[PDB]
Design a protein around this ligand. Structure first.
Ligand code: A3T
Ligand code: A3T
Lengths: 136, 136
């Protein structure tokens, strides 16, 4: 699993065309104020262990940033070893679920399988953009 | 070399704290309308061949998008095999130079070695976000 952590003043997205034949989540749009935006790429081999490490890391990073909103934003582009779409969707659902058992704020998982427009205002402090790898 | 291509309606950045002991480019800020924003991570081993492939690809992608502005935005987070900062800065300078010999529009290379805030409005069409790897 490969993640990009973006500490944002605001974030918004909107689904547009389907990027998969039958996207497993419905279309939609949402916008947020200050949030940790987590671009999430599921890699071949990612399992329950990986999900658990990622969830713990997101929770502790969110806590140090003092954010109360986390966006789990599915992203195809952070790896050249992608999990298949069925497995990836499963892992992202598991990730959202696991995060709620460790983090008390708003957790929003963006729809999987869509092209999306997005806008972000990313903060410029030293911890505002980080990347993480998790494996098992 | 690893690149992320973001077709944006607008982009802006501002340097904040230094991310390196002595950043080799001066601090600054800039903002743009519609542009191809290229997040650029230089990898260990990237040489003139890599620069040339990347430059050609950016030029042809920019042409299909019909954009007339390209932002070369140094980014540490797209690889786990980073080039050292001296080599990386050199390669990004070479990349900007090479791009101008292939692309007729505005080429803006953001300062290397700084933490930056940024804001982007990324388009949602199927070709709006792509990743590329170049090697030699
Ligand atoms: C394109 C851009 O605007 C959008 N943001 C996009 O990247 N969409 C991806 C993910 O939503 C999802 N997807 C498929 N496989 C994976 C995977 N292994 N990991 C994460 N997501 C995946 O399926 C889409 C196309 O494969
Ligand atoms: C942090 C964030 O806001 C900002 N955008 C940042 O990521 N800054 C990076 C790049 O500007 C540059 N840098 C160093 N090595 C490399 C490399 N191999 N490739 C590209 N850039 C590099 O040096 C900074 C810290 O290493």
């Amino acid at each position: 699993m490969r993640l990009l952590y973006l500490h944002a003043d605001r974030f918004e997205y909107k689904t547009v065309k389907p990027a998969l034949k039958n996207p497993p989540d419905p279309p939609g749009e949402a916008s947020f104020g200050e949030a940790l935006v987590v671009f999430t790429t599921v890699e071949d081999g990612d399992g329950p262990q990986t999900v658990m490490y990622a969830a713990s890391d997101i929770a502790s990073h969110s806590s140090r940033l003092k954010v109360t909103t986390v966006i789990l934003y599915p992203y195809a582009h952070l790896s050249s070893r992608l999990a298949k779409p069925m497995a990836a969707h499963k892992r992202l659902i598991e990730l959202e679920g696991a995060l709620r058992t460790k983090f008390p704020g708003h957790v929003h998982r963006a729809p999987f399988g869509w092209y999306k427009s997005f806008s972000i205002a990313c903060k410029g402090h030293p911890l505002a953009e980080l990347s993480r790898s998790f494996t098992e």
